[model samples]
Target: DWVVAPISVPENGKGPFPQRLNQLKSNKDRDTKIFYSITGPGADSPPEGVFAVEKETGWLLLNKPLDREEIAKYELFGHAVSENGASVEDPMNISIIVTDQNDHKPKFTQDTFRGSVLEGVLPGTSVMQVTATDEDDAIYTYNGVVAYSIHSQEPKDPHDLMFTIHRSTGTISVISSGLDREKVPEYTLTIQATDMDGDGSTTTAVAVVEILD
Candidate 1:
């Protein structure tokens, strides 16, 4: 009898060559001379030779490094048999998962993200939601969890602190009342977007907040 649980390996794994991913064994292997092999993706498919099994040891090996961004996982069909090729077990499916690393920063789609709010708007008035996208993993990791904030504002309303942006969301809003259009007709905000929940490296975009009269 033969069964194997799904296995995981890190993406872009560096190695001295042929990194061992896991071991493959059959209950009958202890008493019988066995030869092992693997088929399907990463083994015999287009991206071949990335995965393999030793006939004598049954050690599943990663023959080359992989990038999850290019290919996320692999499904291998395994087989075991006696040297005589007389008896063989049914084929088994082995799942290989590639864990991702934070190798990319959040990037803005444009040079400027424009939004506007009326002059008489009060605190907490929603201005606009700006965004940046990341190339790294999104699920089960914080690599793409982008947090937003105000990096700078032209014609600084230093004392009043005119704008504030939501951390989890990219929504920027007014922070104070009495936003006079005559005194300051337009507000240009430099919004900052950072991955890894705000502590990671950051990228910025310009938002021209117009006091729509």
Candidate 2:
């Protein structure tokens, strides 16, 4: 017969809110096996606040450490029988409250970006401005600055090639002049975004460069 186990966790509470259950059926089919799969928010979508089913067991885990206000609910139910697709009673409910643990990595809402400049702008001209938004506790003035660089160029050339980016605002501009779309037609410069946090908590976003007339 299927049974429900009492959930037990550490009293100290310094962890992933480890869950413990007791009193489960000893049937071979009762052995729980789970896999993790991620899906975005939508209708008939998986519950929020935790990762998919646990890798070891069908138990689900939080994608990131839970916070004080992050409420998670799991409609945990499983069935077991002597044979596959056999008749089985509905399983018990395993509701849990995950304690808050701060282990979140600040990320940009948009991963990749695109911007442009005029075809015949002189050096030190403002091409475009790129900005990133993070949901961490602080605005991250020092460690929040984004560093940028060109990853690739369509007409790759080392001569008279210079593009400067504002360290704070992430503005793309020209430092030296020498870009003729007539000869190159287009310039594919890969812009990368990196975090300056001391812990190396960072992400990379790309920006496309093009010219108009």
Candidate 3:
């Protein structure tokens, strides 16, 4: 039997296609041609064309692009056969791990968010909650994790600086008082959502706040 090794492929478009997986090793019996077969979720089943093995060279390869959002990992079974149709060894379990990459940008759930705050309301009042989602791996820090911030605001005023946003939660709220309806009845804010711990890709959205008297 040939000993199997674990394989890893980075998600997104980080590959040049046909990524080399592992070099199968064989022992005993020289001049015996070996045939390789892969069986698993993406091998001979539903998600076909994801993996393929070279029958002659005993080399494993990734045949298609991988999406972490769709399938994070793959468990495959590998079998080797001799030229005489005899099993060289028992089937080996091969684990294929999909790694995350900073490819996808954060996407806001809504394009436009609206909120209303009472005039002269105290600071730290919740205006509205803006949320974004990333398709990268959330378990890893530099993958799917996202941060929020204010990109731009119109008619800058003292209160304009009074707005604050939660970096992780994407909540926008008031930071200081002086929300006068007469002076600024409405405010247009451009919010930004960034992935990869705020160092990767980013997406923007609009937030409109109406001050009520």
Candidate 4:
């Protein structure tokens, strides 16, 4: 049967009102009749729907389908009430564990980055910077690099083959070669950032660069 949510009673008084579900845990010798329930504008009446409870298990399942939006708003809690029409002399908190569902997707603020450089620069000079933001919180794998198809560098080389990005800060800097704003004048390079998160889930982002001077 459906039950009230957050079953509450007066702090000092005995309040196990409307015996919705009853179970005995301490009395191992006897059969335990565990109870479960749920309450909401949509769940307070018969035909109306509250979650379900398993006898002897105290497990609760949504009696009817639950709205994903509404389910995330409330946290489930449980407690023991008195058998009489009041709370027990001693009160203890009940526990109802709910596992999380992954329904969110990874997002990026900007999918593209762009920058320019001056022609005729040193071999190891700074060209430009590229950065990307990962929406997911926990990450286990990351790989970012620079490559080009268009504006192929004149020397057919990258200022740096590898670019090191700060894992915690998302900073991008050079790792190979130098700059020659003249030789590789107005070159276009492709920057790629990828995160694997060790879960087989991965995301990739890209940007473009050019040299004017």
Candidate 5:
């Protein structure tokens, strides 16, 4: 049997050629040299050519940068053998987990979001939810955590700010009870979505709210 470690690396590619992943050693203490070879997801199949092994040193190496959004996990099988091609150890179930990065920005689903809110609606009334999606992993860390905010609103009559959005949920609700179809028929709002809990990247979209009579 062979021992292995839980390997997880970032999307940041290894700058140098052939970055070391791990090494192999046999407890059997074979007098002959042990040659290491790895196959499976990252080596001998689709998306192969990114992982390789050293025959003499038994050092597992990475050949290129990894992208977790494209392929998050690579399931590999590693083997050890002698120069004579005799199997020295059983194959191992190796896993190379590609960790997440804030490389992806949150993107709004629609170019222009439209919602209708009746005039004279009660304050704190629910209007609509604007959603944005991010490809970065949200399982382990807050790399893709998204927050929403009102960037700007046009037709600043009736009231300066008419709507407010929940930072975490992207829910736009009535903050000011002033909606006048007779005066300001409609309002154009610029909504902003930010990643990393509102501190990372930013994206904005247009929201047209029709004040119905």
Candidate 6:
């Protein structure tokens, strides 16, 4: 099995973002000189401008803020070239891992959500599913993982407990058996999405449910 050196950088940290990725050493041929070049989704290639290397020093630098949500890792190949502009060594594989930070908040697809349900539906009836996209690794704890909940509901006949949300799935369902459009007509509910398991950051949106008989 082949192993490559791994480089890890935290997302959006205060940095010039420079790293000495490789070291150069040469044999007793006093006239020999080596130059370095990097190729990948970073710095001078496809993705362009994300990464750069000091040609003479083999130092790698990240140019801007990295979002693990957008890109978790970068695979780059480094080449050592001789003074004659020919390959002097096999290509070196470099792996970059972007560490997670609670830098981004969860974003709702829309500012408002709308749904409808028939009056007197069953208690387990699903009202609607609200979705939010977070730039954090949900699989990793406290690092952009998100949870959904009902923040508030107007016309407090049900005390905001009539509707329940699946904390992990964001599916809103009915908790109360009785729903009367004649009595309540409609509901103005506030939904909240919290990143880092309700500890890191929060965003809110409004959901209106109209009851029809």
In order, what lDDT does every prediction score? 0.83, 0.48, 0.82, 0.38, 0.85, 0.78
**What would the per-residue lDDT of candidate 4 be over residues 1-213, giving only the tens digit for each residue?**
334344321111222332233332323224333233334333444435443444335444444333332332333334333333332223223322222232323333466656654444443445455444443323222322212112122334544343444443344444454545565544334433344332323344444446564
lDDT-best of 5 and 6: 5
lDDT of 2: 0.48
Cα-lDDT of candidate 3: 0.82
Segments in model 2 whose C-alpha atoms lie over 4 Å from true places: 1-65, 68-112, 139-152, 158-161, 197-199
Off by over 4 Å in 1: 27-32, 135-139, 157-160
lDDT of 3 by residue, 106-156 (tens): 999999999888877778888888999987777756668889999888768
lDDT per residue as tens, model 5, 1-213: 436876888897756867998886665545887788889977999887889988778788888889988888898888888778899888888888888878999999998998988998899998888899888877777678889999999988877899999999988888887688998988888999898888889999988888898
Per-candidate TM-scores read 0.86, 0.46, 0.84, 0.45, 0.94, 0.79
Q: How many times do residue backbones clash in model 3? A: 1
Q: Which run of 10 residues does model 6 get worst, by summed lDDT? A: 20-29
Tally clashing residue pairs in candidate 2.
1
| RMSD list, candidates in order | 2.5, 12.0, 2.6, 11.1, 1.5, 3.1
Q: Which model is ahead, 3 or 5, in terms of lDDT?
A: 5
Q: In model 5, how large is the Cα lDDT of residue 131?
A: 92
Worst 10 residues of 2 by lDDT: 35-44
Candidate 3 has a TM-score of 0.84
Tens-place lDDT digits, model 1, residues 1-213 = 447888888887879678887777777876788888999978998888988898779899888888887888888988888888854678788999888888788998877988888987777899988888988887888888888888888887633478888887788898888687788888888888898887787988888888888
TM-score for predicted model 1 compared with the true structure: 0.86
The model with the greatest TM-score is: 5
Q: Give the per-residue Cα lDDT of candidate 3 at 44.
A: 86
